[PDB]
mmCIF file of C-alpha atoms in Angstrom:
data_model
loop_
_atom_site.group_PDB
_atom_site.id
_atom_site.type_symbol
_atom_site.label_atom_id
_atom_site.label_comp_id
_atom_site.label_asym_id
_atom_site.label_seq_id
_atom_site.Cartn_x
_atom_site.Cartn_y
_atom_site.Cartn_z
ATOM 1 C CA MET A 1 0.081 0.020 0.093
ATOM 2 C CA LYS A 2 1.884 3.094 -1.268
ATOM 3 C CA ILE A 3 1.339 6.392 0.054
ATOM 4 C CA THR A 4 1.422 9.997 -1.538
ATOM 5 C CA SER A 5 0.354 13.069 -1.177
ATOM 6 C CA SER A 6 -2.751 12.380 -3.757
ATOM 7 C CA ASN A 7 -4.313 9.667 -1.936
ATOM 8 C CA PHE A 8 -3.367 10.479 1.998
ATOM 9 C CA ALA A 9 -6.985 11.825 2.844
ATOM 10 C CA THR A 10 -8.201 8.491 1.718
ATOM 11 C CA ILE A 11 -6.101 6.493 4.173
ATOM 12 C CA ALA A 12 -6.047 8.357 6.932
ATOM 13 C CA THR A 13 -9.489 7.558 8.233
ATOM 14 C CA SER A 14 -11.290 7.360 11.400
ATOM 15 C CA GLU A 15 -11.821 3.621 10.052
ATOM 16 C CA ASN A 16 -8.482 2.849 9.396
ATOM 17 C CA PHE A 17 -7.415 4.099 12.595
ATOM 18 C CA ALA A 18 -10.013 1.994 14.711
ATOM 19 C CA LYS A 19 -8.331 -1.171 13.111
ATOM 20 C CA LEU A 20 -5.494 -0.335 15.091
ATOM 21 C CA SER A 21 -7.311 -0.793 18.421
ATOM 22 C CA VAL A 22 -6.584 -4.345 17.978
ATOM 23 C CA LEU A 23 -3.045 -4.418 18.247
ATOM 24 C CA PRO A 24 -1.382 -5.104 21.826
ATOM 25 C CA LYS A 25 0.233 -1.892 23.544
ATOM 26 C CA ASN A 26 3.579 -2.109 22.491
ATOM 27 C CA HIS A 27 2.655 -2.227 18.807
ATOM 28 C CA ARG A 28 -0.415 -0.326 18.801
ATOM 29 C CA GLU A 29 0.960 2.972 20.620
ATOM 30 C CA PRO A 30 4.006 3.482 18.658
ATOM 31 C CA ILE A 31 2.041 3.080 15.274
ATOM 32 C CA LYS A 32 -0.643 5.449 16.240
ATOM 33 C CA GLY A 33 1.280 7.661 17.527
ATOM 34 C CA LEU A 34 3.239 8.147 13.548
ATOM 35 C CA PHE A 35 -0.440 7.916 12.452
ATOM 36 C CA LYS A 36 -1.621 10.763 14.482
ATOM 37 C CA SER A 37 1.404 12.606 14.080
ATOM 38 C CA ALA A 38 1.388 12.032 10.265
ATOM 39 C CA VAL A 39 -2.272 13.572 10.525
ATOM 40 C CA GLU A 40 -1.537 16.476 12.316
ATOM 41 C CA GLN A 41 1.122 17.532 10.167
ATOM 42 C CA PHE A 42 -0.748 16.600 7.038
ATOM 43 C CA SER A 43 -3.504 18.900 8.472
ATOM 44 C CA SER A 44 -1.283 21.754 9.247
ATOM 45 C CA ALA A 45 0.134 22.011 5.983
ATOM 46 C CA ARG A 46 -3.251 22.479 4.788
ATOM 47 C CA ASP A 47 -4.066 25.252 7.188
ATOM 48 C CA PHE A 48 -0.140 26.450 5.860
ATOM 49 C CA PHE A 49 -1.610 26.540 2.317
ATOM 50 C CA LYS A 50 -5.102 28.100 2.627
ATOM 51 C CA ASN A 51 -3.402 31.076 4.945
ATOM 52 C CA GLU A 52 -0.842 31.221 2.681
ATOM 53 C CA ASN A 53 -3.120 31.521 -0.559
ATOM 54 C CA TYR A 54 -5.535 33.891 1.269
ATOM 55 C CA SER A 55 -2.537 36.109 2.352
ATOM 56 C CA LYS A 56 -1.136 36.494 -1.070
ATOM 57 C CA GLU A 57 -4.372 37.422 -2.579
ATOM 58 C CA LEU A 58 -4.969 40.055 -0.203
ATOM 59 C CA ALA A 59 -1.767 41.246 -0.871
ATOM 60 C CA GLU A 60 -2.096 41.423 -4.713
ATOM 61 C CA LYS A 61 -5.481 43.549 -4.203
ATOM 62 C CA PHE A 62 -3.539 46.279 -2.282
ATOM 63 C CA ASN A 63 -0.775 46.191 -4.212
ATOM 64 C CA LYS A 64 -2.760 46.735 -7.354
ATOM 65 C CA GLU A 65 -4.504 49.713 -5.728
ATOM 66 C CA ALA A 66 -0.942 50.780 -4.849
ATOM 67 C CA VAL A 67 0.204 50.617 -8.273
ATOM 68 C CA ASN A 68 -3.388 52.388 -9.639
ATOM 69 C CA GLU A 69 -2.169 55.183 -6.855
ATOM 70 C CA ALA A 70 0.864 55.675 -8.030
ATOM 71 C CA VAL A 71 -0.682 55.995 -11.643
ATOM 72 C CA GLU A 72 -2.754 58.530 -10.776
ATOM 73 C CA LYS A 73 -0.121 60.423 -9.162
ATOM 74 C CA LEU A 74 2.292 60.342 -12.238
ATOM 75 C CA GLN A 75 -0.933 61.208 -14.472
ATOM 76 C CA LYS A 76 -1.479 64.264 -12.212
ATOM 77 C CA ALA A 77 1.831 65.169 -12.545
ATOM 78 C CA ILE A 78 2.160 64.775 -16.429
ATOM 79 C CA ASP A 79 -1.348 66.538 -16.437
ATOM 80 C CA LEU A 80 -0.279 69.568 -14.622
ATOM 81 C CA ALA A 81 3.035 69.931 -16.169
ATOM 82 C CA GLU A 82 1.710 69.847 -19.811
ATOM 83 C CA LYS A 83 -0.835 72.596 -18.282
ATOM 84 C CA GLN A 84 2.343 74.690 -17.609
ATOM 85 C CA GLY A 85 3.585 74.012 -21.443
ATOM 86 C CA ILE A 86 6.268 71.332 -21.097
ATOM 87 C CA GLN A 87 7.074 68.925 -23.806
ATOM 88 C CA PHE A 88 7.355 65.267 -23.043
ATOM 89 C CA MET B 1 -0.255 61.095 -22.905
ATOM 90 C CA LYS B 2 -2.063 58.415 -20.635
ATOM 91 C CA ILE B 3 -0.415 56.417 -18.233
ATOM 92 C CA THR B 4 -0.800 52.991 -17.515
ATOM 93 C CA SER B 5 1.150 50.466 -14.966
ATOM 94 C CA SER B 6 2.818 48.864 -18.387
ATOM 95 C CA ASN B 7 4.167 52.185 -19.308
ATOM 96 C CA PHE B 8 4.870 53.752 -16.036
ATOM 97 C CA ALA B 9 8.606 53.225 -15.976
ATOM 98 C CA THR B 10 8.758 54.517 -19.546
ATOM 99 C CA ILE B 11 7.724 57.873 -18.824
ATOM 100 C CA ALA B 12 8.778 58.256 -14.916
ATOM 101 C CA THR B 13 12.387 58.901 -16.276
ATOM 102 C CA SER B 14 15.441 61.130 -15.183
ATOM 103 C CA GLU B 15 15.161 62.828 -18.772
ATOM 104 C CA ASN B 16 11.158 63.865 -17.976
ATOM 105 C CA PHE B 17 11.858 64.962 -14.432
ATOM 106 C CA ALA B 18 14.739 67.152 -15.582
ATOM 107 C CA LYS B 19 12.222 69.264 -17.901
ATOM 108 C CA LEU B 20 10.130 70.132 -14.834
ATOM 109 C CA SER B 21 13.511 72.180 -13.662
ATOM 110 C CA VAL B 22 12.097 75.208 -15.972
ATOM 111 C CA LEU B 23 9.017 75.881 -14.163
ATOM 112 C CA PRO B 24 8.812 78.336 -11.527
ATOM 113 C CA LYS B 25 8.854 77.166 -8.119
ATOM 114 C CA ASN B 26 5.286 77.922 -7.599
ATOM 115 C CA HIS B 27 4.395 75.074 -10.569
ATOM 116 C CA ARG B 28 7.511 72.923 -10.099
ATOM 117 C CA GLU B 29 7.628 71.958 -6.683
ATOM 118 C CA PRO B 30 3.546 70.819 -6.439
ATOM 119 C CA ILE B 31 4.702 68.435 -10.024
ATOM 120 C CA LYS B 32 8.001 67.449 -8.801
ATOM 121 C CA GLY B 33 6.178 66.611 -5.369
ATOM 122 C CA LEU B 34 3.611 64.209 -7.619
ATOM 123 C CA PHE B 35 5.960 63.009 -9.996
ATOM 124 C CA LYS B 36 8.883 61.594 -6.733
ATOM 125 C CA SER B 37 5.085 60.576 -4.495
ATOM 126 C CA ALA B 38 4.623 58.508 -7.700
ATOM 127 C CA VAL B 39 8.027 56.532 -8.352
ATOM 128 C CA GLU B 40 8.450 55.766 -5.078
ATOM 129 C CA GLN B 41 4.712 54.454 -4.432
ATOM 130 C CA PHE B 42 5.783 52.596 -7.778
ATOM 131 C CA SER B 43 8.955 51.082 -6.612
ATOM 132 C CA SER B 44 7.842 50.029 -3.505
ATOM 133 C CA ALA B 45 4.887 48.376 -5.088
ATOM 134 C CA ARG B 46 7.741 46.396 -7.067
ATOM 135 C CA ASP B 47 9.561 45.605 -3.801
ATOM 136 C CA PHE B 48 6.557 44.485 -1.961
ATOM 137 C CA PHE B 49 5.796 41.886 -5.114
ATOM 138 C CA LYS B 50 9.378 41.014 -5.624
ATOM 139 C CA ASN B 51 9.128 39.932 -1.735
ATOM 140 C CA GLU B 52 5.963 38.442 -1.781
ATOM 141 C CA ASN B 53 6.787 36.354 -4.885
ATOM 142 C CA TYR B 54 9.727 35.206 -2.940
ATOM 143 C CA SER B 55 8.525 34.503 0.625
ATOM 144 C CA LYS B 56 5.732 32.517 -1.421
ATOM 145 C CA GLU B 57 8.012 30.052 -3.123
ATOM 146 C CA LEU B 58 10.021 29.887 0.334
ATOM 147 C CA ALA B 59 6.823 28.462 1.975
ATOM 148 C CA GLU B 60 6.041 26.622 -1.122
ATOM 149 C CA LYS B 61 9.210 24.621 -0.653
ATOM 150 C CA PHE B 62 8.778 24.291 2.842
ATOM 151 C CA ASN B 63 5.027 23.084 2.773
ATOM 152 C CA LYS B 64 5.994 20.510 0.161
ATOM 153 C CA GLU B 65 8.708 18.972 2.534
ATOM 154 C CA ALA B 66 6.115 19.162 5.306
ATOM 155 C CA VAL B 67 3.755 17.227 3.096
ATOM 156 C CA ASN B 68 6.342 14.640 2.167
ATOM 157 C CA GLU B 69 7.316 14.311 5.941
ATOM 158 C CA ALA B 70 3.684 13.478 6.339
ATOM 159 C CA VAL B 71 3.218 11.091 3.938
ATOM 160 C CA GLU B 72 6.598 9.277 5.155
ATOM 161 C CA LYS B 73 5.289 9.084 8.591
ATOM 162 C CA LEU B 74 1.842 7.812 7.530
ATOM 163 C CA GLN B 75 3.778 5.393 4.933
ATOM 164 C CA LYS B 76 5.672 4.097 8.423
ATOM 165 C CA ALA B 77 2.764 3.600 10.388
ATOM 166 C CA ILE B 78 0.725 1.793 7.572
ATOM 167 C CA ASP B 79 3.778 -0.242 6.749
ATOM 168 C CA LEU B 80 4.124 -1.544 10.122
ATOM 169 C CA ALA B 81 0.535 -2.001 10.796
ATOM 170 C CA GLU B 82 0.483 -4.235 8.098
ATOM 171 C CA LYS B 83 3.868 -6.151 9.179
ATOM 172 C CA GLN B 84 1.526 -6.929 12.152
ATOM 173 C CA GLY B 85 -1.542 -8.314 10.038
ATOM 174 C CA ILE B 86 -3.649 -5.309 10.148
ATOM 175 C CA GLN B 87 -6.193 -5.374 7.189
ATOM 176 C CA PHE B 88 -6.762 -2.221 5.630
#
């Protein structure tokens, strides 16, 4: 049974975790520990990704607004200069 | 003369800024002020973009490594369970 990023969630399930309950403690607890650590790290990578995407989008929207404003300021400067007869 | 994000750098040049030096002070300083503010904000939007791109790439590389590790931990748990006869 080969695990990848694509099939992780189809294998790391409650049903499969429950199958481990039949093992004696000396095998059950190390295996459950790895299982839980895997899910916790995978879930955290999901939270990190979703937050990185949202932060990036929020930053892009606000940088677009910064560029728009800079463009408006230069447009105003060039318009005002042209009304003073400056030849660009 | 219409300014956009695409042509900003072709207009906000030293050559064009120098043309403003002929204006009397009452027109020169307000216009130069807008020109400089425009360039400063535009340059800052560039710095913000380049940094956002680099931070995103650095985060993606490290999250890929987190997912790889989570996948390795689950693989180890499932392999160990299978050696104990667990039927997934």
